[PDB]
């Protein structure tokens, strides 16, 4: 029963920068149960954020998730060039898990 | 609506995390003139009666192959073995040139030099050593003990026993052990009627390289266990459901007499060797054995793609990594198990399979990890009744398939009896919301 | 708490909330009449973690007793969930999984509430 | 470590049926791991389909009674392999498909929550055109 | 409790009840100003048995304090004896010998009474 | 108390009384979320001395809580000093140096006051 | 440093030293005490000649 | 152990200035120890003058701005030595003078209290006549 | 560890010549210690292990 949105819809930056995406759900999930993804188009997604701000062993330390109620954030400080591509948001609380509508990150 | 529901602490809420500890062993009331290695100088506390609580409608995930209950008990069993050994003897004077050739199993006849309880007077000693505790160093051949490269061998100090009495593992305050109690349970993935307990069922700390003895029985299925069935290197545990019998005897008088090597150091050894002088055997009824191996290959066909299953023998080589280690009366048998594991199923008797057993005194019982031991022969004809219960099969790397029977790691020997269990930490302080305004 | 040294036992974990509180009380009732370096080391840190969790019940005015209600506004950001929603459609372990991103903040807020309550009756 | 592959890229007829494999080179089983089947329309964002999770086959209400998923875990020659099968491929089913395993052993890791879960390690995505 | 680690001393055991309660109080007054593996092992299990008996005073609302009165009907089947009958013609050890066939049942009944008392003020 | 096993940390020792009580409370707030034979021996006697000082808070009705006020006439022979005299011109260590010739007598007098208070509500 | 012995009035306690295990326990501590005061000493193995 | 000596007995002129030494054979420093300068009129009871205490030179309000005290601690040839110096010796300053060290390390010993202290080990007293 | 601003002279008793004077620097003085010589390591069996 969720149709998520995220802010922004399409964004560009360059290397060495700092960047912000947030995703908002129709409900307000409490247990931070979100997950964010990236892909270059043609490749597969790569889980980089599970449960708000827990990173994997292998995802770079520059990424940071954060939590505020319904709006959950990911920040990239010191952006590297092999990080561009589409991001996706995810709630995974009420079955089925409906996802985000993607955010392309490119260079102007 | 308003619904201004508020905080509430609960002490004692059932909440667990899949955590870890050191456990403490706990036997029954038997333990005083008894000094066996396993449960005397390590754990006094005896548990009289169980308190197992069922858990309804919960499904707990179990993974025995990334369990460290068994690795922790493996460490306590090695350290337990050693702190039951080092205050024993320490036969440093046997590493000599050994004057050995047989005299009437043709083990050998070996005299050598010693030192008596006086140092200046010197001692010449008669003995009977086996072919496999001996190496040919280069009639009337001259040999060496097998363990004079690595560590000095000690004696068992015969007031030590080795009866594998049931050792429980009871968890300290804080932690609980979640038994599975599911039938046909694979040891991996979920479990349906996981019930909590304070200690395990009594496991017997037996050691056996090729196949498992005195185990606990699965009831309905026979269970195939591995870490990685695609990986041929990982040892496949096979757990039966019916207790296969075995009788292992040495039907031979061999008396035990001692030498004074040091002050209080009396090396016990063989003497006259009469009786039914042939290799020590173990007998296995072909009816139950070929029935349970037929059901084993039925279930292995259920795993391995419904293929043509052959049971080759072992790969040969060093007869401790390769053969059937055995734990009878203070003596250690290696039984060439070849005619037990030889078939191709895709036609034997209902009679008796008899396997020979080369026995061994000086054992590096665990492959380098731990310390050695001289096992003195006891007095003569010895019968130990045992329930062969497990198999350890390693598939090989080549439209056929093979289960060459080899062992693997030693902690494997207990993973048939600790699949059901899982040490779990209780965090009892839960914070739940309801409507109070107090305190 | 039910152990040789005393610590709670998991009475009826799979039971949903409305029965599990009743069985928490019956846990108490049966539990207190039911009451080499590895053993010593383990039970010393059992003492240590026990005195830790009773100091958490100490510093919230709860004095080492169960069902101890204190005065905190339970924020809807910690959970927007209704009472009977979780208290009849859930068990306790998955609710502790839900709010494990808040437990340090909850211990924070109950401690300001307990010191605030005793300082206000210190005034009155 | 964990790695995932599946079948190649298959183009079929309208009104056919399709099956897509899922070979999980690294999954110790699918008892404790769980796998998830996720579509992706061309350009449009990814859409969930179904899952296996402790051997309870499920698909969405957008796919109930038409699409079927299976899984056989670790055997000898085979790694743990799942499979997505669809009858009556419409023009809507023209999509990129995905299989992904999640680790569901340490229950407080947060990669999973009571059936639904965050998708740990992906494959290669399979184009299917109608 | 009077020990190096703290545990009660037998103040005036042979004294009959009416004086021995007074000396229990004077025990308290003087006791808290009066306050190799064998030593460690012994005092760890001293900690363990102490925290056990303070949890018995914890789970009866008594909070680790002496002369803690709680609300239980003391059954005449446990003892039909009159107050001044035992409280002036007896000492404490022979009365604990009298009722040692009931102590688990008494701990049982005080625990239902304490959880009943806190659940009833949980209502009110 | 702020330690791995729990015991108070010196929050702002050089701060004079009027700020140091506030920082004693903020000590509490941050302290509980902040929470080979040598280690075992040290923390066992840490348990022992901790349970000792909580029994001092136990036997004064203070139940193991800070800022616990009890009913004793504080004699002018222990100190004739005015409140704001010491509570704004001093820190806590030199005041404990001042009255270290009385601490056993103070523990004495608080124990007669606590047993007197509970025996009087035992009457009432 | 100093004793704290308390008298007990009008009580009669039964004593049985021959089924006491204070003395057997101190006997065990005195043997084990003797030995853990010995084994880090010397060990004249060369006099048995 | 600790021992104290100082200068001898000096008789001077009215309107002169005097200095009296203080050699502390045993003081590990005057950082943690503190010394105290105390007069004594002939027959009349002893009267305090001044002190050094963690290198804060102080004298009484009966001596502020006229009398000055110094101290150099442990050097090689010298033990820790303080010195009392007085300008304008009146007939009132005809007195026996005293230097005394106090141990101020273990703060709960009670020999000291926040600057003022009980005087542990005395010297020999120096007559000064005017 | 380095002292930062001063270099620090430490002793128990500077009048006592027997007590060792510690001198603590404020700048890390370098030293390179080498043995510039091949010397291989080989073993003998003296005992079991
Ligand atoms: C340790 O020991 C453990 C034991 O405790 C052990 O666990 C066991 O592991 C094995 C592993 O293989 C498990 O066996 C598998 O079970 C799977 C699950 O099966 C369940 O679900 C399916 C699907 O159910 C859906 O549909 C039915 C009917 O429509 C509904 O009733 C369901 O509710 C459900 O519907 C929902 O979901 C749909 C989406 O899927 C939605 O559309 C729908 O709307 C709903 O939401 C059922 O069919 C199964 O039924 C079985 O059981 C019932 C009774 O419960 C019986 O009546 C029935 O006869 C069935 O036996 C069950 O409910 C299976 O997917 C899996 O099946 C494969 O193998 C079997 C062999 O037994 C084949 O027959 C089968 O065809 C599958 O093979 C296909 O898949 C592989 C790979 O995917 C292919 O390579 C293969 O070629 C084949 O593909 C071909 O066939 C397909 C048709 O099936 C075809 O479509 C393809 O295109 C292709 O041609 C297998 O049975 C076993 O259950 C575990 N048991 C337990 C107790 O845990 C563990 O593994 C051990 N671990 C280790 C490490 O050793
Ligand atoms: C470990 O490391 C530690 C480092 O962290 C180290 O600590 C250091 O130790 C050394 C030890 O020597 C310390 O150095 C000494 O400091 C002493 C204290 O000095 C302070 O106080 C005096 C007096 O202050 C009074 O008067 C002034 C002005 O009138 C006021 O401002 C004050 O408030 C105060 O007034 C009150 O008190 C009066 C009574 O005394 C009252 O009358 C009055 O009303 C008030 O109540 C000050 O003069 C000092 O000023 C200095 O600093 C200021 C800035 O603060 C500067 O502007 C100024 O130039 C000064 O440098 C300071 O405030 C000193 O007494 C002592 O001095 C001796 O040595 C120095 C060499 O530096 C000489 O110059 C000096 O003359 C002294 O030598 C005399 O004394 C010895 C023995 O007594 C004699 O043998 C010698 O011959 C000489 O006597 C001759 O000179 C006299 C004149 O001074 C004369 O009168 C005699 O008659 C005779 O002719 C010395 O400086 C150092 O401070 C420590 N530092 C720190 C940070 O701790 C420690 O030792 C190390 N330990 C070990 C074991 O290694
Ligand atoms: C139980 O035991 C089995 C037996 O070994 C074991 O299976 C093996 O698992 C490993 C994973 O640890 C597998 O290795 C991966 O294989 C895939 C695909 O392998 C297939 O194809 C190759 C080549 O055709 C065949 O040789 C093979 O037999 C299979 O058919 C590879 O894609 C993986 O490559 C990644 O890792 C490589 C290093 O090993 C690097 O080349 C690189 O980092 C690869 O990552 C790449 O990923 C993307 C492609 O997916 C690419 O876009 C990126 O840029 C990146 O470069 C890897 O080699 C191995 O094949 C399995 N072998 C067998 C016989 O099954 C189980 O893992 C084990 N299970 C447990 C629980 O222990
Ligand atoms: C909800 O609570 C859980 C509680 O476990 C929490 O999960 C934890 O999250 C933190 C923060 O994301 C994890 O800590 C990180 O783990 C990653 C794993 O790869 C490491 O890379 C990190 O180390 C880097 O950062 C450190 C700090 O800057 C550096 O010092 C270091 O050198 C590395 O650069 C860091 O350790 C933690 O692992 C998880 N733990 C678990 C069990 O999941 C979750 O994040 C919480 N959710 C929210 C929304 O807060
Ligand atoms: C091993 O024992 C055999 C048997 O005792 C020794 O053979 C004897 O050698 C002596 C040498 O003088 C002869 O006199 C005997 O007649 C031999 N006896 C027999 C039966 O052959 C042999 O020397 C011993 N060898 C070693 C290396 O100890
Ligand atoms: C466990 O042992 C039992 C008895 O030995 C086996 O049970 C037999 O199973 C076959 C087919 O499964 C039936 O036809 C027989 O009737 C069963 N025996 C009885 C007495 O009922 C069982 O097969 C064994 N388990 C496995 C997995 O083989
Ligand atoms: C193990 O099996 C063999 C079978 O070859 C047993 O040998 C028989 O033993 C009995 C009793 O000793 C004799 O009566 C028979 O003559 C023996 N031979 C045969 C062919 O039956 C052997 O005794 C068994 N071992 C034990 C301990 O029972
Ligand atoms: C500590 O090291 C510093 C730098 O090596 C020294 O600092 C110099 O001090 C002299 C006189 O004290 C000045 O003239 C220089 O300008 C300082 N250097 C700099 C870069 O500013 C210092 O002397 C050393 N400490 C001691 C006690 O000698
Ligand atoms: C779980 O096992 C116990 C004992 O083996 C049995 O009594 C119980 O019925 C089992 N639970 C289920 C759900 O079968
Ligand atoms: C297995 O060993 C136990 C040990 O006492 C024994 O009671 C049992 O009879 C044995 N099993 C069989 C089938 O003899
Ligand atoms: C075996 O022979 C020895 C030799 O005397 C004898 O003492 C022993 O009793 C014999 N064994 C049996 C079972 O009789
Ligand atoms: C083993 O011995 C037991 C009794 O000792 C007997 O019942 C069984 O048949 C024997 N087994 C074999 C294979 O001889
Ligand atoms: C493998 O064997 C079992 C029993 O023999 C049978 O039911 C199964 O269908 C066989 N496998 C295949 C793929 O036919
Ligand atoms: C929830 O409410 C409390 C009120 O005590 C507040 O302090 C806290 O910051 C709120 N949560 C968030 C995420 O703002
Ligand atoms: C979830 O949170 C929002 C924010 O308070 C609330 O309005 C909504 O009603 C909550 N959901 C339910 C089912 O109560
Ligand atoms: C004594 O009274 C209590 C009432 O609380 C009752 O529960 C108990 O059973 C009675 N005793 C007997 C022996 O019946
Ligand atoms: C002993 O018990 C009976 C039963 O209540 C009671 O009536 C009787 O009075 C009791 N005896 C005394 C002396 O109170
Ligand atoms: C101070 O007052 C108390 C009153 O409780 C008294 O007991 C005590 O003796 C007094 N102090 C002195 C030194 O008399
Ligand atoms: C010090 O004690 C006496 C005795 O009570 C008292 O009168 C006097 O006022 C006290 N000093 C101050 C400053 O209060
Ligand atoms: C020193 O000499 C030995 C002799 O072969 C050689 O192995 C070693 O590598 C030499 N050292 C260096 C740094 O090359």
Author numbering:
A (entry chain D): 1 to 30, 30A, 31 to 107
B (entry chain A): 30 to 60, 63 to 135, 152 to 185, 187G, 188 to 309, 312 to 321, 321A, 322 to 358, ...
C (entry chain B), E (entry chain J), F (entry chain F): 514 to 548, 572 to 660
D (entry chain C), H (entry chain G): 1 to 35, 35A, 36 to 52, 54 to 77, 77A, 77B, 77C, 77D, ...
G (entry chain I): 79 to 127
I (entry chain E): 264 to 309, 312 to 314
Please quote the authors directly.
One of the principal targets for HIV-1 vaccine design is the trimeric envelope glycoprotein (Env) spike that is embedded in the viral envelope.
A de novo initial model was generated using the cryoSparc20 program assuming C3 symmetry, followed by using the program Relion21 to refine the structure to 3.9-Å resolution. The final structure of the T/F100 trimer–8ANC195 Fab complex was similar to the closed structure of the previously determined BG505 trimer–8ANC195 complex. The rmsd between equivalent Cα atoms of the superimposed structures ranged from 1.5 to 1.8 Å, indicating that the T/F100 trimer structure is in the closed conformation. However, the T/F100 trimer structure has a glycan at N130 of gp120, unlike the other, previously determined, timer structures. The position of equivalent and ordered Cα atoms differed by more than 7 Å in the N-terminal part of the FP (residues 514–522) and in the N-terminal heptad repeat region 1 (HR1N) (residues 538–548) of gp41. Associated with this sequestered FP in the present structure was the repositioning of the HR1N region to avoid steric clashes between the FP and the HR1N region. The VRC34.01 antibody bound strongly to the closed trimer (BG505), whereas it showed negligible binding to the T/F100 trimer even at high antibody concentrations (10 µg/ml).
